[PDB]
Amino acid sequence: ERPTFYRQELNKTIWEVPERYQNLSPVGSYGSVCAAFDTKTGHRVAVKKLSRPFQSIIHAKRTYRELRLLKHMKHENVIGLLDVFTPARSLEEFNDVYLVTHLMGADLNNIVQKLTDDHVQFLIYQILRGLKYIHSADIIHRDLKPSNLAVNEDCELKILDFGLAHTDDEMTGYVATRWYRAPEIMLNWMHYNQTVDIWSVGCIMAELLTGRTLFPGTDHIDQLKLILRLVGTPGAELLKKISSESARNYIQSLAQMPKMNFANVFIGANPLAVDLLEKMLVLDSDKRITAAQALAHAYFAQYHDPDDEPVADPYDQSFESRDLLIDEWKSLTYDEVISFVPPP
Ligand SMILES: CCN1C(=O)CN([C@H]2[C@H](O)[C@@H]3O[C@H]2c2ccccc23)C1=O
Ligand SMILES: [Cl-]
Ligand SMILES: [Cl-]
Ligand SMILES: [Cl-]
Ligand SMILES: [Cl-]
Ligand SMILES: [Cl-]
Ligand SMILES: [Cl-]
Ligand SMILES: [Mg+2]
Secondary structure, eight states: OOEEEEEEEEEEEEEEEETTTTEEEEEEEEEEEEEEETTTTOOOOEEEESSSSSHHHHHHHHHHHHHHHHHOOTTTOOOOOEEEEEEEESSGGOOEEEEEEEOEEEEETTTTTOOOHHHHHHHHHHHHHHHHHHHHTTTOEEEEEEGEEEEETTTOOOEEEOOOOOOOOGGSSSSSHHHTTTTHHTTTTTTOOHHHHHHHHHHHHHEEEHHHHHHSSSSSHHHHHHHHHHHHHHHHHHHHHOOOOOHHHHHHSSSOOOOOHHHSSSOOOHHHHHHHHHSOOOOSSSOOOOHHHHHGGGGGGGTTOOSSOOOOOOOOOOOGGHHHHHHHHHHHHHHHHHHHOOOO
16 A cells, blocks of 8 residues: 655655655755656656655645645646555555656747747647636636746647746846736735736747747836836726725826737737737736636637637635644644545
């Protein structure tokens, strides 16, 4: 039943893992990561040891959230969970959590090379295919950007690093951590929803077409000015939807600007790519195209197959409004570890 574990020290950390995982080598350091060879499946894998998973109520709940999300995701264009384990033999001695996934090599930055329009079609198609699945479970990724997209030699893509809810310092200044975020979440205009992810896809697609960041702001306000120059200042309809009165007041201090001609911004791009960008990069989130609608856009005619674009099983997020003690979150996490069933 229970595998045999072995111990070793890897850069000031003790790792205790099943014998199936061999040739551990550190790679990065919310947790430390090692690459390894999985002798049961033949895959190269990433193994993450969570750091201080149950040190506070906030941290214990985040550990449970990450494990629940990773156990649910079962789609070709989304990261999946190969294994989860603990060396503990009972709840009473439970302290450490380890997560295992396929080892990812290059991200989209390490290719964004010389991309043809056919490459852009295939890459964005796969992002939207994974997003249709994610959004069908009422999950919001929140942190889509090139470093969170893994790509292999055959141009096949997986979404990873779901937003588990970044600090104020992480979002300050001339930083890629903010350049892909929708304005309504960057500035806390209103309660946001899954449409924030489509704004990020528009920003990524633009950068694949031009080779340049679309909105490389030096701070929050500089970035807003770059955004409004392209898409136009808001009308009265959107202004009514901004719940923050102070944010409303600041927007109205800016001189009004019309939306620009996207064919004159994205010079020489496929006219169908220009059309899709105009439908993604809409300031009013209610009016953006959805992932399911975008898959049917003529830009993807070569790849679209409505019989091979699956949706997710329902995902129960009621725990997110639940108030529990550290040891109750810990017990819920332990149950999810021991009930894990590996993929075929
Ligand atoms: C170093 C390369 N690499 C990956 O291959 C996956 N990945 C991250 C995944 O999104 C999630 O956090 C990290 C991780 C490691 C193991 C299990 C689950 C996770 C990551 O950083
Ligand atoms: Cl083993
Ligand atoms: Cl995977
Ligand atoms: Cl343990
Ligand atoms: Cl990035
Ligand atoms: Cl659901
Ligand atoms: Cl569920
Ligand atoms: Mg990341």
